[PDB]
Symmetry: C3
Subunit: 222 residues, 3 copies
């Protein structure tokens, strides 16, 4: 449309749709209960992202937020996506290493706090307070990354695949607070069209790339 | 009140309230942990529906949505109901057959996508896009119905009761997208008062009727 | 600020932040999976409350609701807090006694209904209907308290700690509907600044006080 960022919302919609259908077909037949869990979790992630990219593409998941005396276009649908897809991504990691339930609830709850405070930050109309919420969300993110590294006798197959996905997760997820800080939600240094491109590449990599690595590994089977 | 549909919201409120109290009393005493699960799940469903019917009856769960150049009365509280009650109904089915956790997460997540895209469709102000969301929600519904039929050594008691509830579920749930399509959320072929009657009969049947069948079966006991 | 109640939102923010960091540090090292669960649950509660107190303090979690012909300041962020923190508090109790899953789902679902109908009551613009929602929420609360007392061979260590936390829970949680009834959400007998003080003392006691009792007990270890 008239929104220059439309092309990246359209490409992200397509890519998440295609990833969803690929993983759907791929998991057809799988009978191992353990593998079944990883396919469900991992197919659901880009399915949810597909709907929220389409909602941005059609204009539904966009609102205007007054701050710095302007009307700032804020895509809130990203936070409805991430609210469900980032704990699912963490559950994939957690199941892979057989984490303790206490550790899984710490991770999902820290993740809820990360996304919910990012959403409050995104909708806050007092510009300086936006970055108070950024900082608290960043601190929740660093707790999560801490736990993925210092909280975890795996069969060597598990260990290997987990190490790769853990490194993929730390590098990609750490970029999100930087994009938000420099982008239209934060300091406004990078235009919305380039921010939207950055988040499209991260999201597709963190969902479809991550899941291609995982669903190719024998680590997901008993 | 002045809303002609008030009578059906009032009758649905009453019927869900009465079903809730019936199942509450009925489960009193039950000590079998397995049965306890089915009573909790099955009592909670019409309890939640009671609150959301009452919220429609009092006007709280109604909003106006501009589309086709008019101010369309949209009862959004139905989606807050269904968001929680339809996965609970699916958990009742899933526990009955002892489904794999992977299969249960596929079902709840597809259900979330069904209701959340129905809600976006219900609130979308570009009329043609309303039916894009309908189609995606319908596709999620057909995945769910697919899985209830082709994804599942039960004791014969389980099998029998599950087959009846599965057929009840396919027939009733399949009517919802048709009512939405022809009703005030969609093409506007059927007036809101008759739509509200249709959804009242479906909801009471899918909640209180379904639960009367289930909570009468010995299938829920170890 | 100019809101007289600011001081109690500031003190509650501080106290929940300090409790969160205390329990975070305290649980460092714990390796017992059972204890790990109680630390996760119990650290998350004041972490979530911290964010929602800060959101009230900065003005984000406050809205104006017209009722009784005025513009009533309603802090809705309390309900986003309680939606997650009160089932977590109930899970702490439930895990302590090894409750049946049926019993845990009854408790979380009744809790959802308690907070969600309190939120509808808080935002309802027809003054008399506000108290219809209060009554239904109160009835959900009495079901929960009923179950904590008449629904539950514990090692004596569990029993002892559970009895203390159960009495703490009945006394503190029972005060919330009274504060709401006499406060700005209800009859408006007590000013918002004193209501906000009452809820700060209850919340800190029900979260940080409760958790100090629990995380000091050996009951949380296998
Ligand atoms: C757990 C564990 C831990 C909990 C984390 C603690 C932090 C909780 C914060 C959360 C609070 C939510 C705030 C939000 C609902 C309030 C919206 O009001 C806005 C601010 O003026 C209005 O903007 C205009 C509109 C805005 C749009 C916001 C909508 C978003 C919707 C995302 C939710 C999705 C759920 C799918 C529903 C179907
Ligand atoms: C920070 C602590 C660790 C955590 C405590 C929470 C406080 C978070 C805020 C930190 C910082 C003050 C925020 C204040 C930004 C300030 C420069 C605003 C600039 O002033 C202008 C008018 O006053 C704002 O208009 C518009 C000007 C804008 C274009 C300026 C953008 C502001 C930028 C803020 C960037 C924050 C990061 C650098 C944090 C990295 C650590
Ligand atoms: C570091 C830790 C908490 C930092 C304490 C700061 C104290 C600020 O006091 C006044 C400074 O003018 C704020 O009042 C001025 C009015 C405004 C009030 C701001 C107070 C809050 C914004 C700070 C509450 C804690 C913060 C948390 C920063 C994120 C954390 C996760 C790193
Ligand atoms: C966005 C990309 C970084 C673009 C820059 C290109 C850099 C190349 C990839 C980044 C890094 C790659 C990590 C390799 C991994 C290998 C480590 O395996 C170790 C052996 O068990 C695990 O222990 C310990 C594991 C340790 C590994 C942690 C990786 C680091 C995390 C970097 C943070 C992120 C990038 C910061 C965002 C930036 C874009 C603002
Ligand atoms: C999971 C697994 C899978 C997730 C599924 C993917 C699809 C996610 C979509 C969801 C997004 C939610 C959208 C909604 C919150 C945004 C509301 O803004 C409206 C649109 O202009 C404003 O209408 C005016 C008001 C409207 C009213 C909407 C309110 C509704 C509330 C229902 C939620 C309930 C939660 C109980 C809370 C107590
Ligand atoms: C069938 C599958 C996806 C269908 C692809 C279609 C392609 C439409 O391209 C243009 C036709 O004018 C839409 O741009 C015109 C502007 C508008 C853009 C509409 C594109 C989206 C509405 C379609 C995205 C996928 C759809 C999913 C339909 C539901 C699915 C679950 C059956
Ligand atoms: C809303 C009602 C249909 C009103 C119309 C009256 C029709 C009578 C009931 C509908 C049907 C009844 C199904 C009977 C069942 C018996 C099948 O058991 C089989 C043996 O294991 C199960 O295998 C395979 C099971 C197969 C059974 C699937 C049932 C069919 C599903 C029909 C879709 C729904 C109706 C479409 C909605 C319409 C109202 C627009
Ligand atoms: C389960 C099991 C059981 C379910 C219980 C049954 C009762 C369900 C009721 C719920 C319905 C939610 C209503 C609400 C979303 C509708 C908001 O519209 C308001 C009323 O005019 C507008 O006020 C203006 C704004 C208001 C602010 C409301 C926002 C609140 C947000 C709290 C949710 C949090 C989620 C964290 C998200 C990140
Ligand atoms: C109640 C049943 C058990 C459950 C069924 C649900 C019905 C709930 C409502 C019960 C009660 C009628 C509500 C009516 C309050 C009524 C006195 C309102 C006062 O009239 C004034 C103008 O008409 C209201 O303006 C302003 C005047 C205000 C300052 C008056 C405040 C009203 C108070 C209501 C208090 C309710 C409790 C006493 C319930 C304790 C049991
Ligand atoms: C006690 C139980 C249910 C009580 C039934 C009452 C019947 C009220 O009928 C009319 C009285 O004028 C209400 O219509 C007047 C228009 C208004 C309609 C109000 C009807 C609803 C407010 C009552 C629905 C049930 C209530 C539940 C009260 C809370 C319960 C949990 C104790
Ligand atoms: C807000 C406070 C009450 C302020 C008033 C000061 C009163 C002192 C504390 C209240 C009470 C203390 C309860 C002691 C406990 C001991 C009971 O242990 C029993 C032995 O197993 C448990 O069986 C059965 C256990 C039984 C115990 C239930 C306690 C009672 C619950 C009281 C309801 C609350 C207060 C009503 C709210 C009021 C503030 C409007
Ligand atoms: C059969 C396999 C390999 C998958 C192909 C199905 C299509 C869907 C997406 C899968 C590919 C993505 C790999 C993740 C990595 C990336 C960094 C994603 C960033 C996207 C940018 C565009 C580059 C090309 C693509 C259009 C595939
Ligand atoms: C003891 C048993 C049988 C239950 C009676 C308690 C009351 C609550 C509801 C239970 C009855 C409903 C059966 C479900 C089937 C239907 C198709 C429901 C559609 C409702 C339409 C009105 C018909 C009559 C009723 C008011 C019972
Ligand atoms: C090391 C221990 C004891 C904890 C201290 C860390 C600080 C955070 C909060 C812990 C203290 C609270 C106990 C709960 C009981 C109360 C009734 C809370 C009501 C608060 C009112 C103010 C009273 C003093 C306080 C500022 C500690
Ligand atoms: C599928 C998409 C994924 C994996 C997205 C991850 C998003 C985050 C890690 C977001 C982090 C943020 C912060 C740490 C700071 C505040 C802003 C956020 C929400 C962008
Ligand atoms: C308790 C009520 C139940 C069982 C309701 C079920 C609702 C559905 C199956 C709704 C389905 C819909 C679609 C498939 C298309 C879009 C509109 C919906 C949400 C009505
Ligand atoms: C961390 C805070 C806790 C433990 C808060 C508990 C809140 C309740 C028990 C609230 C109860 C309410 C009712 C019973 C009636 C309606 C109003 C409420 C939501 C305040």
């Amino acid at each position: 449309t008239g929104r220059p960022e439309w092309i990246w919302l359209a490409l992200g919609t397509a890519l998440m749709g295609l990833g969803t259908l690929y993983f759907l077909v791929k998991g057809m037949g799988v009978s191992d209960p353990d593998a079944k869990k990883f396919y469900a979790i991992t197919t659901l992630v880009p399915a949810i992202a597909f709907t929220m990219y389409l909602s941005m593409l059609l204009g539904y998941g966009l609102t205007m937020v007054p701050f710095g005396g302007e009307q700032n276009p804020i895509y809130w649908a990203r936070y409805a996506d991430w609210l469900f897809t980032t704990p699912l991504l963490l559950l994939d990691l957690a199941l892979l290493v057989d984490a303790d339930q206490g550790t899984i609830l710490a991770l999902v709850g820290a993740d809820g706090i990360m996304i919910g405070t990012g959403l409050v930050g995104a909708l806050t109309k007092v510009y300086s307070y936006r970055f108070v919420w950024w900082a608290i969300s960043t601190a929740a993110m660093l707790y999560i990354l801490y736990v993925l590294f210092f909280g975890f006798s795996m069969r060597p197959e598990v260990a290997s695949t987990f190490k790769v996905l853990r490194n993929v997760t730390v590098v990609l997820w750490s970029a999100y607070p930087v994009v938000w800080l420099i982008g239209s939600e934060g300091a406004g240094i990078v235009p919305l069209n380039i921010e939207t491109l950055l988040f499209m590449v991260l999201d597709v990599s963190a969902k479809v790339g991550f899941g291609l690595i995982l669903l190719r590994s024998r680590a997901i089977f008993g």
